[PDB]
């Protein structure tokens, strides 16, 4: 029974998470540092799976194996709390998220049925340098934990977690960062998703949103109408020549937050260079030819579970948005217009970084889902959403 608020979570016990190097939910933390020492001998044997299941590292460069992972996630990954929509990460998106600079094949950790070889579980790690308050640490980011619906509630997820932990330890890394919609010991920060309608007619039709407080449909479409072209002078897609200045802009901008990525220039290229239907980045190049701002959002459609025939909910997720000369409000207004132009139905953003300064003004509505941020084997004070400067996939 996963908890979604900390009031529900503070009641229950965590048989697995109590055994792990994370702070207790009750804890107020005032120190900064590891919970347990770096290990100088690591278990060489994989952890034991239930009878009939085996480990398999997934080579995603094999298109057949990538399709197997795509299918596992398409049928069993995260749903909304009403079981009406399920994320539909594309194979090309999965390659973007799972093969960044430094990726390792043993960190694409699958579980297969022994007799049929069917893929029924997965978890992944990717390397990341993380800045947390006054410390920079090489960590991994853990994502795409998924157990087949037919295999749920058999304690397979703790085995997946211990096994990726072991495989990361073997590479000399003893901290991780991750996000989840559920409350576990112990969030370092809690963010909330907000939603900006772009195609309100379709969102109402699929019951992603509802005609609120009796306005007509006519009145709703006019309320959410956007200009057909952006307003900021010099806005254009990011190009190869912009990689260094985007890296420079992002690095200085992120210093004001307390949990942030520390990206090399090669990582900036990976995470921001535009790729159709995966990642969009637009820069502002001013009258002097200098790039002074940039906006970015990634593509994440969702299956409509009750009518899986009726196309899909096309959503854009705000990524990193850096402003030094264009007002952030204007930059995000342009982000909405570009997402509308590109055929997105909704534009999603969290309330982290400086996002609360524009959410209400740009007619975002508050969502029903939280996003909790976590660190593994790092005990530090929690922080408000506006100090979180990290966006995962």
């Amino acid at each position: 029974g996963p908890a979604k608020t900390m009031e529900e979570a503070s009641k229950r016990s965590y048989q697995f998470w109590d055994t792990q190097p994370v702070p207790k939910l009750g804890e107020v933390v005032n120190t900064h540092g590891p919970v347990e020492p770096d290990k100088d001998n690591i278990r060489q044997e994989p952890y034991t799976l239930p009878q009939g299941f085996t480990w398999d590292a997934l080579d995603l460069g094999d298109r057949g194996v990538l399709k197997e992972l795509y299918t596992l996630l398409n049928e069993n990954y995260v749903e909304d709390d009403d079981n009406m929509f399920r994320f539909d990460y594309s194979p090309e998106f999965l390659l973007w998220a799972l093969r960044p600079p430094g990726w390792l094949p043993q960190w694409h950790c699958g579980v297969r049925v022994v007799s049929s070889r069917k893929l029924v579980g997965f978890i992944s790690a990717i390397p990341a340098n993380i800045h947390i308050y006054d410390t920079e640490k090489k960590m991994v980011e853990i994502n795409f934990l998924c157990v087949h619906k037919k295999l749920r509630s058999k304690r397979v997820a703790p085995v997946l977690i211990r096994e990726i932990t072991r495989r990361v330890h073997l590479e000399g890394i003893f901290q991780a960062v991750y996000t989840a919609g559920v409350v576990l010991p112990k969030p370092v920060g809690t963010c909330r998703y907000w939603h900006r309608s772009l195609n309100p007619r379709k969102l109402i039709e699929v019951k992603f949103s509802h005609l609120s407080r009796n306005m007509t449909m006519q009145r709703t479409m006019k309320l959410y109408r956007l200009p057909e072209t952006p307003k900021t002078a010099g806005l254009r897609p990011m190009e190869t020549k912009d990689i260094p200045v985007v890296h420079q802009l992002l690095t200085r901008y992120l210093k004001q937050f307390h949990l942030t990525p520390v990206m090399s220039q090669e990582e900036v290229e990976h995470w921001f260079y535009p790729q159709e239907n995966i990642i969009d980045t637009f820069v502002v190049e001013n009258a002097n030819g200098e790039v002074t701002d940039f906006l970015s959002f990634y593509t994440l459609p969702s299956t409509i579970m009750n009518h899986p025939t009726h196309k899909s909910l096309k959503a854009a997720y705000s990524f990193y948005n850096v402003h030094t000369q264009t007002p952030l409000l204007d930059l995000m207004s342009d982000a909405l217009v570009l997402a509308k132009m590109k055929g997105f139905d909704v534009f999603n953003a969290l309330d982290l970084m400086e996002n609360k300064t524009f959410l209400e003004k740009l007619k975002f509505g508050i969502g029903d889902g939280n996003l909790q941020y976590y660190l593994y084997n790092w005990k530090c004070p929690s922080m408000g959403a506006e100090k979180v400067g990290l966006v995962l996939q």
């Binding site: 995260v78 749903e79 909304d80 709390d81 009403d82 009406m84 929509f85 399920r86 994320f87 994502n143 996000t179 989840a180 919609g181 909330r192 998703y193 939603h195 992603f208 949103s209 509802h210 969702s302 999603n348 509505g365 508050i366 969502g367 029903d368 889902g369 939280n370 996003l371 995962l392 996939q393």
Partner: peptide, 7 residues
């Protein structure tokens, strides 16, 4: 990560 929709 988390699938949210408008309240």
């Amino acid at each position: 990560x988390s699938f949210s929709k408008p309240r």
